[PDB]
UniProtKB/Swiss-Prot annotation, chain C:
The gene is GRIN1. It is linked to Neurodevelopmental disorder with or without hyperkinetic movements and seizures, autosomal dominant: An autosomal dominant neurodevelopmental disorder characterized by severe intellectual disability and developmental delay, absent speech, muscular hypotonia, dyskinesia, and hyperkinetic movements. Cortical blindness, cerebral atrophy, and seizures are present in some patients. Neurodevelopmental disorder with or without hyperkinetic movements and seizures, autosomal recessive: An autosomal recessive neurodevelopmental disorder characterized by severe intellectual disability and psychomotor developmental delay, involuntary and stereotypic movements, spasticity, and inability to walk without support. Intractable seizures manifest in some patients. Heterotetramer; the NMDAR subunits are modular and harbor tiered domains that function in concert to regulate opening and closing of the cation-selective ion channel pore. Forms heterotetrameric channels composed of two GluN1/zeta subunits (GRIN1), and two identical GluN2/epsilon subunits (GRIN2A, GRIN2B, GRIN2C or GRIN2D) or GluN3 subunits (GRIN3A or GRIN3B) (in vitro). Can also form heterotetrameric channels that contain at least two GluN1 subunits and at least two different GluN2 subunits (or a combination of one GluN2 and one GluN3 subunits) (in vitro). Changing residue 8 to R: In NDHMSD; loss of glutamate-gated calcium ion channel activity. This is Glutamate receptor ionotropic, NMDA 1. Belongs to the glutamate-gated ion channel (TC 1.A.10.1) family. NR1/GRIN1 subfamily. The chain crosses the membrane at residues 5-28. It is found in: Cell membrane; Postsynaptic cell membrane; Postsynaptic density membrane; Synaptic cell membrane.
Swiss-Prot record, chain D:
Contains an N-terminal domain, a ligand-binding domain and a transmembrane domain. Agonist binding to the extracellular ligand-binding domains triggers channel gating. Residues 36-50 dip into the membrane without crossing it. Heterotetramer. Forms heterotetrameric channels composed of two GluN1/zeta subunits (GRIN1), and two identical GluN2/epsilon subunits (GRIN2A, GRIN2B, GRIN2C or GRIN2D) or GluN3 subunits (GRIN3A or GRIN3B) (in vitro). Can also form heterotetrameric channels that contain at least two GluN1 subunits and at least two different GluN2 subunits (or a combination of one GluN2 and one GluN3 subunits) (in vitro). In vivo, the subunit composition may depend on the expression levels of the different subunits. Found in a complex with GRIN1, GRIN3A and PPP2CB. Found in a complex with GRIN1 and GRIN3B. The lineage of its organism: Eukaryota, Metazoa, Chordata, Craniata, Vertebrata. This is Glutamate receptor ionotropic, NMDA 2A. Changing residue 175 to W: Found in a cutaneous malignant melanoma sample; somatic mutation. Changing residue 129 to T: In FESD; decreased protein abundance; decreased localization to the cell membrane; changed glutamate-gated calcium ion channel activity characterized by decreased glutamate potency and decreased open probability. The chain holds residues 546 to 841 of 1464 of the full protein. Changing residue 89 to T: In FESD; likely pathogenic; decreased localization to the cell membrane; results in increased agonist potency and channel activation at lower glutamate and glycine concentrations compared to wild type channels. Changing residue 79 to G: In FESD; likely pathogenic; decreased localization to the cell membrane; results in increased agonist potency and channel activation at lower glutamate and glycine concentrations compared to wild type channels. Changing residue 246 to E: In FESD; likely pathogenic. Disulfide bonds join 180-235.
From Swiss-Prot, chain F:
The gene is GRIN2A. Heterotetramer. Forms heterotetrameric channels composed of two GluN1/zeta subunits (GRIN1), and two identical GluN2/epsilon subunits (GRIN2A, GRIN2B, GRIN2C or GRIN2D) or GluN3 subunits (GRIN3A or GRIN3B) (in vitro). Can also form heterotetrameric channels that contain at least two GluN1 subunits and at least two different GluN2 subunits (or a combination of one GluN2 and one GluN3 subunits) (in vitro). In vivo, the subunit composition may depend on the expression levels of the different subunits. Found in a complex with GRIN1, GRIN3A and PPP2CB. Found in a complex with GRIN1 and GRIN3B. Changing residue 41 to A: Found in schizophrenia; uncertain significance; unchanged function in ion transmembrane transport; unchanged agonist potency and unchanged channel activation by glutamate. This is Glutamate receptor ionotropic, NMDA 2A. Belongs to the glutamate-gated ion channel (TC 1.A.10.1) family. NR2A/GRIN2A subfamily. Contains an N-terminal domain, a ligand-binding domain and a transmembrane domain. Agonist binding to the extracellular ligand-binding domains triggers channel gating.
Amino acid sequence: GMMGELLSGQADMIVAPLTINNERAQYIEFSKPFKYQGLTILVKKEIPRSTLDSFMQPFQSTLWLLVGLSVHVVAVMLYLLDRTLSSAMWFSWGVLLNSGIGEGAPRSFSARILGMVWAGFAMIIVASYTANLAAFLVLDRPEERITGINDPRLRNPSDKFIYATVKQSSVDIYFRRQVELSTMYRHMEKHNYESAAEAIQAVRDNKLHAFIWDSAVLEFEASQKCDLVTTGELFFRSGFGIGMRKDSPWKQNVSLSILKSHENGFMEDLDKTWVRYQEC
Amino acid sequence: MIGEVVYQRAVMAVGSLTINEERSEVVDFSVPFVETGISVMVSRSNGTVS
Amino acid sequence: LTFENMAGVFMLVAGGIVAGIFLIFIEIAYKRHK
Amino acid sequence: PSAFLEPFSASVWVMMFVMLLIVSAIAVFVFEYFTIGKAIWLLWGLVFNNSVPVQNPKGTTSKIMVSVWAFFAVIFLASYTANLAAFMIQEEFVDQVTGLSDKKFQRPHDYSPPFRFGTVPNGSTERNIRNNYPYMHQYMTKFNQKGVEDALVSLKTGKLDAFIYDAAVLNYKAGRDEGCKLVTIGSGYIFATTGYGIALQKGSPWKRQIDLALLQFVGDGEMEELETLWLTGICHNEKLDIDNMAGVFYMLAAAMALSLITFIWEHLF
Amino acid sequence: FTIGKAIWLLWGLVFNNSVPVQNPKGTTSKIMVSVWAFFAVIFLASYTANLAAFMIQEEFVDQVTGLSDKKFQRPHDYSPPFRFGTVPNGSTERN
Amino acid sequence: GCKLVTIGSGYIFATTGYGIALQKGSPWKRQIDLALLQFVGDGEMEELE
Ligand SMILES: CN[C@]1(c2ccccc2Cl)CCCCC1=O
Ligand SMILES: *[C@@H]1O[C@H](CO)[C@@H](O)[C@H](O)[C@H]1NC(C)=O
Ligand SMILES: *[C@@H]1O[C@H](CO)[C@@H](O)[C@H](O)[C@H]1NC(C)=O
Ligand SMILES: *[C@@H]1O[C@H](CO)[C@@H](O)[C@H](O)[C@H]1NC(C)=O
């Protein structure tokens, strides 16, 4: 890659996003970092579930089917107790639908008591339905976002969910040179991609489920493509640098300049015109 | 601190010492280990305004 | 069903029931006054 | 569903019922200054739903009393809905068998379907059950399995009922299972709590130093870090139904029965 | 007066049924009114659920955004003077 | 009470770091830098933070 090209003498400088590692720094001389960007996880933002039509779906349609049968049975019992059955049926149907027609004229006082009791039962059923709706409502956004490497879903992987980074990158070095995630590294080694853009396209096309990459790149990708979002707290926070060979005369002058541009506000203007220029 | 480092009184200055383009032109020192900068602080206890 | 909920407004409703006679007397006196 | 766990059917319900009756009596008395049953029906409706046409009360001062009663009913229904929502927030998943003391282990064939006891030989669990429950050992011999992974596979496939084995490895398996479908019995129970230790030759000169080193490790917090980095699991760290109103519909049917019985007794008179 | 009665019953069924008139006459009219009332009750329940769920939303203020802002940019006039805090001898003062 | 809070999530006007000051041309720089990179790569800096 770039490090090999620079070491071989084919190049004299690496002006590109090159994360400052230890293995890289052992052979080449990094300048002062012109940016600070840790690693984050790019994931696809699932569309919110705006049903607005789950009426008989939430609990069980059999309850809605049995409600009418129970109402008819209660009406029949009221008719037999009265010994205008159609008028009483309409009145009950209006009461269970808050119509308030007022066409019900029970004969006996027991019929009146049963009618009042029925209304109370209906009120209770309505309350139960409202509670169920609240449970479904409050239970919105069931899916959560994995919180970086510390999340248990990443420490223990699975074939169903795959999270793979980019081959021949500092990231791979970070996973390899830290023996606390050997399972994660083994899982990621079977899904690495040729280039970052290919991984972005695969993630957006549901080919992957998570991407591990620099914050400076993933944040811009999320800003550009609203279909994707970035999650996970910044980890391995080490910025890019102008990699170049140790035995070079520019080492004492590039870095200072990068400092000056970092303090004169030039890098802030570059970020505004190239990274921070849009949102979603 | 920087003055003591320049005049060979001390060979190392570990502490809260921000990297600058003026200090680097005098003392050459290692890569940053804490990301810092310039920030503004203000109190918001006057009103929640939720 | 919290006890306070059944109390915090039902002591009030009992007060209203026992207070109805107060305004009963007030209005039946007002009617006769003019 | 907890159709009976509500504070209903208590003194509060009887207190509010008699308060409603007293309020209805006071309203009838105010109106009089055939309206008793009508006022009672209207007040019951106002408690339940305002679709109950009652002509019993026609008074000025009475209107304020009816408004106060309606305010109380509205507050009560709002509190009831809030209580149902709060109860629907939580759920109960206590346990299944509640330890080895359950009669299922004592009677493995007499109740319903056979309850298999999964176990692995060569271990201390087999020796413990042989030295404590010789009767259960003979029954469990027919289900002596091979390994922990095989036991988990069999449990996930329904071929076994319960698996009895060492607590630490079982807890690890529960914390590293897909879907958290299988859990240890109860909230985590130990039939014979014991340590692991580190075996040494009889009279070895290392025991007096190995024990001190292990005590130093457990007292310095290293054991907690190792447990967090080696035994933590995702499952462990996690924390209008037809059958829901079937009971209240049984109560409604009983209400219909009492209604018709009252019709009979009222029509004798 | 049937048009006004129908409009009032529709509005009430939307809000509350305490507005009765002799608008629905016939089985078809009663069935239509019942269906409308059921739909309005469902909408009401959905609105109440949404209002209850909305209580879990909160936000915080942030004043100006960075040193590039109207407040920080001009010290003179504008409003009551905005004090600037900066301990000297540091890198911030030099920058 | 966490009454006072920096503006927004925190935007650094001129982002830099701290480092460890050394004499100009000190032999320790080329090795202190490597040690610090090893520390940040092994997750120790996260634990200290
Ligand atoms: C008053 N009517 C409502 C109600 C609120 C609370 C309890 C029962 C009921 Cl019935 C108002 C809120 C939407 C649902 C509804 O019908
Ligand atoms: C480095 O910069 C200094 C001052 O900016 C200058 O005197 C010197 O010639 C420069 N050296 C190279 C190799 O650019
Ligand atoms: C150990 O268990 C195996 C089956 O898992 C069994 O065949 C063998 O006999 C056991 N060992 C002894 C000494 O009985
Ligand atoms: C340094 O601090 C002292 C006392 O705080 C002050 O008198 C002096 O002016 C400061 N110098 C600079 C360059 O900030």
